[PDB]
Design an enzyme around this catalytic site. Structure first.
Site, PDB file in Angstrom:
ATOM      1  N   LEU A  11       0.832  -1.219   0.000  1.00  0.00           N
ATOM      2  CA  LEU A  11       0.000   0.000   0.000  1.00  0.00           C
ATOM      3  C   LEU A  11       0.866   1.269   0.000  1.00  0.00           C
ATOM      4  CD1 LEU A  11      -2.824  -1.000   2.544  1.00  0.00           C
ATOM      5  CD2 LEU A  11      -2.988  -0.835   0.040  1.00  0.00           C
ATOM      6  N   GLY A  12       2.089   1.235   0.505  1.00  0.00           N
ATOM      7  CA  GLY A  12       2.917   2.413   0.433  1.00  0.00           C
ATOM      8  C   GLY A  12       4.207   2.213   1.190  1.00  0.00           C
ATOM      9  N   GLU A  13       5.319   2.488   0.527  1.00  0.00           N
ATOM     10  CA  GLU A  13       6.543   2.773   1.233  1.00  0.00           C
ATOM     11  C   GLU A  13       6.332   4.132   1.904  1.00  0.00           C
ATOM     12  OE1 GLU A  13       9.138   1.205  -1.948  1.00  0.00           O
ATOM     13  OE2 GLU A  13       8.132  -0.455  -0.889  1.00  0.00           O
ATOM     14  N   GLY A  14       7.262   4.501   2.774  1.00  0.00           N
ATOM     15  CA  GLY A  14       7.078   5.756   3.450  1.00  0.00           C
ATOM     16  C   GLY A  14       8.373   6.444   3.835  1.00  0.00           C
ATOM     17  N   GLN A  15       8.123   7.359   4.774  1.00  0.00           N
ATOM     18  CA  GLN A  15       9.074   8.362   5.253  1.00  0.00           C
ATOM     19  C   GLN A  15      10.132   7.568   6.040  1.00  0.00           C
ATOM     20  OE1 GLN A  15       6.719  11.975   4.862  1.00  0.00           O
ATOM     21  NE2 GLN A  15       5.293  11.274   6.425  1.00  0.00           N
ATOM     22  N   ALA A  17       8.494   4.389   7.159  1.00  0.00           N
ATOM     23  CA  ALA A  17       7.348   3.510   7.362  1.00  0.00           C
ATOM     24  C   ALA A  17       6.930   2.821   6.050  1.00  0.00           C
ATOM     25  CB  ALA A  17       6.222   4.327   7.940  1.00  0.00           C
ATOM     26  N   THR A  18       6.530   1.549   6.140  1.00  0.00           N
ATOM     27  CA  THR A  18       5.857   0.810   5.047  1.00  0.00           C
ATOM     28  C   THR A  18       4.421   0.464   5.482  1.00  0.00           C
ATOM     29  OG1 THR A  18       7.919  -0.024   4.159  1.00  0.00           O
ATOM     30  CG2 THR A  18       5.973  -1.292   3.586  1.00  0.00           C
ATOM     31  N   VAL A  19       3.506   0.252   4.516  1.00  0.00           N
ATOM     32  CA  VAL A  19       2.091  -0.003   4.815  1.00  0.00           C
ATOM     33  C   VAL A  19       1.586  -1.197   3.994  1.00  0.00           C
ATOM     34  CG1 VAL A  19      -0.243   0.982   4.710  1.00  0.00           C
ATOM     35  CG2 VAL A  19       1.670   2.418   5.422  1.00  0.00           C
ATOM     36  N   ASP A 123       1.415  16.969   9.815  1.00  0.00           N
ATOM     37  CA  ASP A 123       1.597  16.512   8.408  1.00  0.00           C
ATOM     38  C   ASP A 123       0.261  16.295   7.606  1.00  0.00           C
ATOM     39  OD1 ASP A 123       2.967  15.594   6.050  1.00  0.00           O
ATOM     40  OD2 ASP A 123       3.059  13.514   6.859  1.00  0.00           O
TER      41      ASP A 123
HETATM   42  C1  LIG Z   1     -11.855  -1.302  -6.340  1.00  0.00           C
HETATM   43  C2  LIG Z   1     -10.559  -0.851  -5.654  1.00  0.00           C
HETATM   44  C3  LIG Z   1     -10.354   0.651  -5.712  1.00  0.00           C
HETATM   45  O1  LIG Z   1     -11.294   1.425  -5.550  1.00  0.00           O
HETATM   46  N1  LIG Z   1      -9.118   1.090  -5.944  1.00  0.00           N
HETATM   47  C4  LIG Z   1      -8.880   2.266  -6.780  1.00  0.00           C
HETATM   48  C5  LIG Z   1      -8.235   3.249  -5.819  1.00  0.00           C
HETATM   49  C6  LIG Z   1      -7.743   2.416  -4.619  1.00  0.00           C
HETATM   50  O2  LIG Z   1      -6.313   2.592  -4.534  1.00  0.00           O
HETATM   51  C7  LIG Z   1      -5.790   3.451  -3.585  1.00  0.00           C
HETATM   52  O3  LIG Z   1      -5.033   4.364  -3.836  1.00  0.00           O
HETATM   53  N2  LIG Z   1      -6.224   3.152  -2.338  1.00  0.00           N
HETATM   54  C8  LIG Z   1      -6.533   1.778  -1.920  1.00  0.00           C
HETATM   55  C9  LIG Z   1      -5.664   1.351  -0.749  1.00  0.00           C
HETATM   56  C10 LIG Z   1      -5.757   2.370   0.372  1.00  0.00           C
HETATM   57  N3  LIG Z   1      -5.031   1.933   1.546  1.00  0.00           N
HETATM   58  C11 LIG Z   1      -4.231   2.669   2.338  1.00  0.00           C
HETATM   59  C12 LIG Z   1      -3.097   3.391   1.980  1.00  0.00           C
HETATM   60  C13 LIG Z   1      -2.375   4.108   2.940  1.00  0.00           C
HETATM   61  C14 LIG Z   1      -1.152   4.893   2.579  1.00  0.00           C
HETATM   62  N4  LIG Z   1      -2.744   4.128   4.234  1.00  0.00           N
HETATM   63  C15 LIG Z   1      -3.849   3.424   4.581  1.00  0.00           C
HETATM   64  C16 LIG Z   1      -4.499   3.228   5.796  1.00  0.00           C
HETATM   65  C17 LIG Z   1      -4.089   3.806   7.131  1.00  0.00           C
HETATM   66  C18 LIG Z   1      -5.265   3.937   8.092  1.00  0.00           C
HETATM   67  C19 LIG Z   1      -2.966   2.995   7.769  1.00  0.00           C
HETATM   68  C20 LIG Z   1      -5.588   2.396   5.503  1.00  0.00           C
HETATM   69  N5  LIG Z   1      -5.658   2.070   4.223  1.00  0.00           N
HETATM   70  N6  LIG Z   1      -4.584   2.703   3.655  1.00  0.00           N
HETATM   71  C21 LIG Z   1      -5.280   3.713  -0.138  1.00  0.00           C
HETATM   72  C22 LIG Z   1      -6.189   4.151  -1.265  1.00  0.00           C
HETATM   73  C23 LIG Z   1      -8.043   0.953  -4.963  1.00  0.00           C
HETATM   74  C24 LIG Z   1     -12.406  -2.596  -5.739  1.00  0.00           C
HETATM   75  N7  LIG Z   1     -13.734  -3.023  -6.306  1.00  0.00           N
HETATM   76  C25 LIG Z   1     -14.211  -4.291  -5.681  1.00  0.00           C
HETATM   77  C26 LIG Z   1     -14.779  -1.960  -6.204  1.00  0.00           C
END
Ligand SMILES: *[C@H](CC(=O)N1CC[C@H](OC(=O)N2CCC(Nc3cc(C)nc4c(C(C)C)cnn34)CC2)C1)CN(C)C
Length: 289
Positions: A11-15, A17-19, A123
């Site tokens: 989901l993301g490399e970071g500063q 931090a990785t996710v 931030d």
């Molecule tokens: C469709 C899937 C969909 O809608 N996608 C298009 C756009 C989505 O991609 C993203 O950029 N997303 C999805 C993952 C999401 N997760 C994320 C990233 C980060 C940096 N932090 C966090 C948290 C924090 C609370 C830790 C939680 N989640 N993230 C970022 C945005 C995917 C699917 N069909 C079935 C409709």
């Protein structure tokens, strides 16, 4: 809580931090682990968990579980479908006045809450406003956040760029203003190539400030005399915005930081009580995958 979660997508490399998307191997909820991989200190990263557990709010990200012994420390959170940043870049989506009213609303209630609890989310950027199934926005990335030159240059309030040491809540507000412009214009409002150039952008766009507009400006540690630009009228920049909205933006981008409109001052404004009201989150725009 170590092996507990089985790894799904990155989901993301970071500063520092990785996710990861992961699946709780008991609850079977999708979750977002923040790996804070470290060495010295976990002082700032322990403080984060601390500050986090101390907050209950629907527009604040939900700290579920932290865990793990080694070079690394893991914060578990509810997974979120998109961030407000992708929502921008997705061209598919054209933004409606009442879409933005809705995005701003939830942001500032998150903020109202925070600053009542004397915290700064130092931030604030648009990839840090996440959105769930039902278009419920949430602040996140609290790794920079103290309990009353840190944001990523474009959303850095001036006082900070001018090396202010003691700084208040007007920091978070500048950002929210940057995010609103970015929401309106669908592109970074003031994208400096350098701290020095970030100030140039700020002033040429909004005009260089007076000692009336900002007393105690020159008393900042890094203060330095830029050329005097007149500024640009907001209804030029936002040929879009109606007067209720212009008023709001202009208050968020006041230079004097004690004269900067607070979250509450802003939530208590016509704009929000004026039609059109906020789209239900469920009816907010969703992107491709
Ligand atoms: C469709 C899937 C969909 O809608 N996608 C298009 C756009 C989505 O991609 C993203 O950029 N997303 C999805 C993952 C999401 N997760 C994320 C990233 C980060 C940096 N932090 C966090 C948290 C924090 C609370 C830790 C939680 N989640 N993230 C970022 C945005 C995917 C699917 N069909 C079935 C409709």
């Amino acid at each position: 809580r170590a092996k507990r979660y089985e790894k799904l997508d990155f989901l993301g490399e970071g500063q520092f931090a990785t996710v990861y998307k992961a699946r709780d191997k008991n609850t079977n909820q999708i979750v977002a682990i923040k790996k804070i991989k470290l060495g010295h200190r976990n002082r700032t990263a322990l403080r984060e968990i601390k500050l986090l557990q101390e907050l209950s709010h629907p527009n604040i990200i939900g700290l579920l579980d932290a865990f793990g012994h080694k070079s690394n420390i893991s914060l578990v959170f509810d997974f979120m479908e998109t961030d407000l940043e992708v929502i921008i870049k997705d061209n598919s989506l054209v933004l409606t006045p009442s879409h933005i009213k809705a995005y701003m609303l939830m942001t500032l209630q998150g903020l109202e809450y925070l600053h009542q609890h004397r915290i700064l989310h130092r931030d604030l950027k648009p990839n840090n406003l996440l959105l769930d199934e039902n278009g419920v926005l949430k602040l996140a990335d609290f790794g920079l956040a103290k309990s009353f030159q840190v944001v990523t240059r474009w959303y850095r309030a001036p006082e900070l760029l001018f090396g202010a040491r003691m700084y208040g809540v007007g920091v978070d507000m500048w950002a929210v203003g940057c995010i609103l412009a970015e929401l309106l214009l669908r592109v970074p409002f003031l994208p400096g190539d350098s701290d020095l150039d970030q100030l140039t952008r700020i002033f040429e766009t909004l005009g260089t400030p007076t000692e009336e507009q900002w007393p105690d400006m020159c008393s900042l540690p890094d203060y330095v005399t830029f050329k005097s630009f007149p500024g640009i009228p907001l209804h030029h920049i936002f040929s879009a915005a109606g007067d209720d909205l212009l008023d709001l933006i202009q208050g968020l981008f006041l230079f004097n930081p004690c004269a900067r409109i607070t979250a509450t001052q802003a939530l208590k404004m016509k704009y929000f009580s004026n039609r059109p009201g906020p789209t239900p989150g469920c009816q907010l725009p969703r992107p491709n995958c």
